[model samples]
Target chain A: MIYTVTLNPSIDYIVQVENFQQGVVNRSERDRKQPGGKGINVSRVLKRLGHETKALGFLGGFTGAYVRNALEKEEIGLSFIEVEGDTRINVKIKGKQETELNGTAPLIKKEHVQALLEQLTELEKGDVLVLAGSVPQAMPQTIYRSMTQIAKERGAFVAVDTSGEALHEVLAAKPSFIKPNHHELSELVSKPIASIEDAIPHVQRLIGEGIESILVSFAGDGALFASAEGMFHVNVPSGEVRNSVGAGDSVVAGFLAALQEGKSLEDAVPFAVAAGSATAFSDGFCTREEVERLQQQLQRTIKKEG
Target chain B: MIYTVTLNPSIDYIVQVENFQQGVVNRSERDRKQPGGKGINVSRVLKRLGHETKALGFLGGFTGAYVRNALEKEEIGLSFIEVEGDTRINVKIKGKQETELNGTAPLIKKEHVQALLEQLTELEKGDVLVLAGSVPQAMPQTIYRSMTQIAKERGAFVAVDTSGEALHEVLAAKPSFIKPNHHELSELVSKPIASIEDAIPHVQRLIGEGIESILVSFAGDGALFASAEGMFHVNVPSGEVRNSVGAGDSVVAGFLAALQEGKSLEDAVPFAVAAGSATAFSDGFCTREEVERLQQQLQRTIKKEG
Candidate 1:
């Protein structure tokens, strides 16, 4: 079984206005709402790909109820803890140009964190515990580390997808997988990682330290998978990228799905790249059919390091 | 009993961001949500004024549920009809300058309209029915006319607070009252109402044609009340206008509350102005206490006819 935890989820509101003027009233030509967060994205994509995944997190108030109803409507598994404050709303306005106004996350108290920790203890061997997205700023940095440590102790593979200090704290747990893009890799190693070749040594360094593996995604340029099978670069199928928002999440979902199905690293890399490319090529997230359709076009090229 | 009808209500989302930049991602420093609509505003103020008022309208989905929960939390009486589609969410972004992005109202079908009409059938004589704010554009313009005609036949006084075609249509029913600001009055009479004196002739014209009365607000310039007692200009209390959004609704609420308490037009007009001024002077809607305090400062002056 696969479980994804989003400490703070949001109601993502996308509105389109023509020539949206500042300091004045504007009306939306069209608007939409969806449940949002990195872990939520992974769970949604996994569900789209026909995987058995449960989403666990904290939700509260009407906005939180909106998230629950939306997830239930999608028929995805949920185990969210009801909290005090309402979940945040991230407004994405596509006008003459795109504008984003994301709300501050709800406060997650120590008891709420403890409740999530208790939920994580139920995970057993062969279970994958995915910790994705940013934790509430009010929460301690040790939250991701604590969850990862417990999941690892239970012999469950932990996947961490986040950036900055939270990422810094979680890396100490030697998570089974951490897919940081090239930029996040630079921030982590405190060095410039300009290309796939630039990230190879750093990926090996993390692997040498007992981390299971690492996947580094580069927009349009493709992605890199570092494992015992050496370094392999997955070729992203050539297509027009319509939605870049959840492509990385699809990659994570795809990789996990492939691993769960007992596919080898060489084969799983292409599926990861294919799933991401499929989502990028469409308006919504990638479905199993679309991912499989794009799989034939993806090519995995292994690199020989001197 | 007092009944307020909001044909289309919304979840008002107020977000504050420091130094908001267009076409870039911004984070809210603080955010909050409140139930919104002109009639809902009147009902909330009425509740604060210790009046027995029931809110009537069409609501739907989770957004509707939020509105229900919020109003119930405030202990206001609700008689809303459930329908298809979620209620709108109007976003008010306060940064260096305030900006608004109003969402479209939910679809109200003919059945939904009939449901409300049926609810209005239960009203008796002396009951006040307030028809306020804009309705869904898809609704026939005769909606307010139909509501007013029915309520008037039952001997219930109808207060209409809307503008444009709907206001024009409802005028034929000889509504108990219509409060159009000088600007809306100008639109209705097809002549510029430059001052309180200019609006008197137009107010008398509506009254001569069987319409009960009219009130024209001119912002800080004060307001005009024309009825059987002749034309009167309200002396607005001198104070900084801190909030302007709900001031008009506050006037309607105040006027209704006064009349319900058996006050005459002479006394009620000043109280209405006091309530409007109190709301304009504060950050939110006026409480009964603020209205009473400001009531002493208000002086009603009868306009001399030329």
Candidate 2:
């Protein structure tokens, strides 16, 4: 089973306003509320791809209940720790230009963190644990690092999808998989990567540091995959990107789902790229058929450094 | 008994961000959620002032459930019709300046409207029905007019707090009370009201047209009250204005609460002004003691037009 943890999940309140003006009351043309967080998105996408996934996180108050109920309706497994405050709401204002107002995360106390840590101890060998998204303000930055060590000790593979300090700290624990976009890869190594070629060396360095696999996305330019066996460049299928919000999470879910099915890292690259492109080309998460169709159009070529 | 109708209520999600920028993600410093709608505000303030009142409206899905649960926790009476879609979430972004992005109201079906109208039928003689706020896009603009007629037919008094077409239409229904700020009153009369003296004639005109009371608030300049008894100009107590969001609703709640306790129209003005000031001077709804303290400082002098 794959367990995805979203430390600071939110109710993404998307509102579309026509001719929005600041400092005044603006009525939305339409609005929607969705369960939002990188880990939650990965779990949702994994479920869509026919994978056994459970979402683990801190959920509190009515907003958390909404997220729980939404995931339950979709039949995704959940074991979220209940907290004191309501989960934050991230407001996305879609007008002429998109603007986001993300609320402060709920307070996840020490006991709550201990409870989550206890849940990680239940993971067994061959299981996948995904620690995605940013940690809440109340949580220590080394939380992912601690969880990674625990899951690794249990012989489970840990896939991390975050950036900055959390991402940097977790690397020391040697997570099995990490997906960072080209920009995040630059930040990780403190170097400006102008292209995928520039990011390859850094990805190789991380793999050499005992991490198993690294996937670097370059948006519409496709992606790069590196493992102990070798490195490969993938050409994603061309399509009009309708929404890019969940594309990265889709990539993580697709790659992990493929690996769980006993597919080799080389065989998972196409699935990862296809899953991402499909989500980018659609308004919602990619379906199994959509990913499969896009996979047929994908090209994966092994890379050799000069 | 007092009943307040909020045709479209919402969860007012207030998010405070430091140096908020457009076209990018901004994290909130702090946030809070409150059940919001003019009539809902009236019910909350009324409850805070030790009055027995029921909140009536259309509530649906999880967002509605949150509002219902919140009101229930506060022990405010609720008789809302269950609708098909979730209630709206109004996002208030507090940064350098306050920007409001109000969501689209939930779908209020014909059956829901009929149900709400049926609830109005339960309003007995001498009962006060407060029709407040804007009607949802799905509902007719004449909804308040229709509701006022129904309530008045049952010998119950109707106090309307809305603007534009709904306000104009309800005027013909002979609502017993209406609270229009100076700006709204100018729009109602299609004339610019420069001061309290300029608004008195229009207030008297509304009273002459069969409406028993007209209260026009002029922000910090105090408020004017016109009724069959006489025209009075109230000097509101001096205090630093902290929040003006619910001050108007507090006025309506305060006046109704006083009148329900057998106070004359003249006696209700001080309570109303004090309530508005108290709310404006504090962060949340005014306590009864706060209103009483301000009430003693209030000076209500009769206006004898030359």
Candidate 3:
């Protein structure tokens, strides 16, 4: 079973306006609402890839109910803790120039954090626990670290997708997997990773330190996966990147889904890269058919360094 | 009883961001959500002024549920027809320069319109039905006209606050009252109204044509009211205008609240102006105390026009 945790989730309100002007009323040509969170995204893509996944997090107020209803409609499992304040709404304005207005997340009290911690204790061996997204302002930044410790103690594979201090703190728990883009990898290693060659050594070092697996995406250039077995560099199929919002989450979901299906680490790298590229090339998440087609076109070369 | 109808309601999502730039993710320093529509504004203000009022409109989906729950929290009476699509969310971005992104209203089916019409049949004589705001694209532009005709035929007084074709159409129904700001009044008369003197003749003409009552707001300059009895020019209290979004709706609410308390049109004009000015001077709607304070500072001189 795969369980994903979104500490602070939101409803992404996308509005498209033509010739948007400041200090005046502008009418939208179209608008849409969708549940948004890194973990939630992973859970959604995992479900699309024929995997069983449960989403756990904190939700509150009407916006929280909205996110819950949306996820339920998609048939994704949920065990969200109801909190006090309303969940935040992130506005994505698609105009000549796309502008985004992100709201402050709802306050997560100590008891609510304890409740989420309790839910993580249910994880067991062979279970995969994904801790994604940023922590709420009221909660400690080391929340993912705590959850990683709990999941690791229960022998569950822990995959973390985050940045900044939280990403640094979670490394202490030695998560089984961590997916960071080239830019994030630079920030993590405190050095500029200009190419895949620069990123390869850093990912290899993390794997050597017992992180087990590290996937570093170079975006349109492709991706790199390093594990104890070896390093696999995969080239993604070329296509126009329509939307890149959930591309990384798709990579995490695809890699985990492949491993759950008994695929070796080297065999799963192409599937993960294909899933990420497929999502980036489409307006929405990648379908299983799209991933399969793209995976066939992927070229991967295994490299072993002394 | 006073009943306010908002044909196309919304959830106004207000977000404040500092140094906002286009094509980037901006974080809101603070944010709030409120039920938004001209009639909803009037209903909220009327309730604040100690008037028994009910809000009627078409609402749907989770956003609609949010509006219902918010109004219920305020203890306001509601008879909204549940429709198919979610109620629209209008984004109000307050930054270095204020910007608004208004969403498209939900689709109102024929059955939903029928349901609302049935709800209006319950209004009795002496009950005031205030039809405010724009009509949805799916519905006829003459919807307010149809509603006013029904209310008037049943011996109920009808007040309308809208502009464009709907405003022109509703006048044919001879509504008891119509509050048009200076700009809307100019559009209705097909001529620019530059001063208080220029607007009086046009308003008096509407009154003579059997509209019964006409209140034209000149914003900070003050307001002019004309009816069967006479014309009164009111001087509003001096204050900095913090927000002008709900000022016009506040006038309709205060006027109706005063009339419901057995006050004559002469006495109600000051209360209405006070309510409008108080709301314009505050971040939120005016309370009863604020209206009373502002009303005491207002000066009105009645003129018996030939």
Candidate 4:
């Protein structure tokens, strides 16, 4: 089973106006809203890959209820802790100048955190736990680390997706998989990593620091993977990049799906690269067919320099 | 009972930010949202004035659902026709300059119009129909006159409270009352009325045009009323004007509440004036106590000549 957690989730309200002048009553010519969060994004990609995934998170107020209700329409399952205040609404105003009014993150009480962790307690061996995205300010920054401690102890393979102090904290918990993008790894090492060569050192450091598999994506040049067996550098099939928002999570989904299908960590690298590239080529989330098409291209044209 | 019908409604999102530049991401320091439509605003003030009134309109989608729920909390009886798509959400950003992004009026489909008219059909004799605000392009612009015709056929009194063409269209329908402000009365007459004296002739023209009673408020100068018998001018009571957003709606509310309590036209005028002044004196919508205090203050001062 694949599980993802969004400590704080929201409905992204995208409003499109012609020339967005602030402090004026601007009427949106078009607008749309969707339930979105990093963990939920991961779950969406995992489901597209035909994986049975459950989304765990803290939701509150009517917006929170809406998020849970929205997920019901999708293939993923949900088990969220109810908190005070509605889930934050990220307003994306598109016009001459785009702007955002992100709502205050929901107040996730200690009890809510404990409740979320208790749900993760049910995950056993062969299960993968994806701890994703930002938690509310009311929560301690080390929330992912705490969840990882309980999940790892229960013999679940935890996928940690965060950076900075929180990422460092979770790294100590020795998660099975951690996907830190180039810039994220750079911030961890407190230096700028301009190339894939620069990111390699940080991936090794994380492996030495006890993470079972470190899949560090260099955004365009594909990703470097350091699993228990060996480290490998894989290249992605190049395509027009439509959206990079979900590409990272899609990579995580691809690697996990490959692992669950009895593929070795080294063999999963190509699938991870293909998944990222496929998502970049689509406007929305990646689909199974798109992934398959990209996976085929990766097999026929891409080379591994492991 | 007084009823206000808004053919189209919108969710007003008010956000306050700092000296926000154009084409840049503006974060809201303060934010608030409410279902705002002309008739809805009138009904809200009426609820505050202790009037038993109902709001009639078309609402759709999640925002439509939210407005219905918001009305329940406002203590105003509501019967809205369900329509396709969500009602529009107007975005107002306050900073160095007040910027607004008003929601486009929802497309009121033929079925949606028929559904609303069906609900409006329930009004009977002695009920007061307040045809307030403009019907968006979604429906026929002559909806107010049609509503007035139906009310006339049913022997119920109808009040026309709109501007421009829609207001003109209701003229031949012979409404019992109209509450056009100084500026609107000027446009209706194609001649600007500078004072209460100048507005008298315009009000008289409406009376001759089949309107029984006409009230023209000159904002700070108070208001003037003209009927078949005669015309009279009233003085505005003194108060610190805090806001002017919904003052006119408060007047409609106070007048309807007084009428429901069996007050004479002469008696109802003061309450309406006091309600308007009271709302302008305080921030946001007026409270019962504030309305009452203004009522007492006006019962003494508004009788004074201008």
Q: Of the candidates shown, which would achieve the greatest DockQ relative to the real structure?
A: 2
Name the candidate that leads on TM-score: 2
Worst 10 residues of 2 chain A by lDDT: A297-306
Residue-by-residue lDDT tens digits, candidate 1, A33-151: 89998899999999888887999998887899889988998899999998898899988887567889888788777788888899988999999999888778788776888888999
Residue-pair clash count for candidate 3: 1
Put down candidate 1 lDDT per residue, B1-306, tens digits, no spaces.
Answer: 899999989898888788788888898897888899999999998888888789999888888899998899899989899989888889988757889998877777788888899999988998999999986788988799999998998999999999889988998899989899899989998999878777877888898888887788987788887786577677678789776677899999999999988998667888888898889898778989999988877753544442
DockQ scores of all models, one per candidate? 0.76, 0.86, 0.83, 0.50
- Model 2: docking quality category: high
Stretches of candidate 1 above 4 Å error? A191-193, A300-306, B190-194, B197-201, B300-306
Identify the runs in model 2 with alpha carbons over 4 angstroms from their true place. A300-306, B300-304
C-alpha lDDT of residue B128 in model 2: 89
For model 3, the stretches where C-alpha displacement exceeds 4 angstroms are A299-306, B300-306
Better lDDT candidate (1, 4):
1
Better of 1 and 3 by lDDT: 3
Give the least accurate 10-residue stretch of model 1 chain A, judged by summed lDDT.
Answer: A297-306
- What are the per-residue Cα lDDT tens digits for candidate 3 across B159-217? 88999999998988999999998999999989999778888878878888998888888
Each candidate's number of clashing pairs is: 0, 0, 1, 12
lDDT of each: 0.86, 0.87, 0.87, 0.78
User: For all the models shown, what interface RMSD does each have?
Assistant: 0.8, 0.8, 0.9, 2.4
True contacts kept of each: 0.86, 0.94, 1.00, 0.68
> What docking grade applies to model 3?
high
Taking chain A of model 2 alone, its TM-score versus the true chain A equals 0.96
Cα deviation of B223, candidate 3, in Å: 1.1
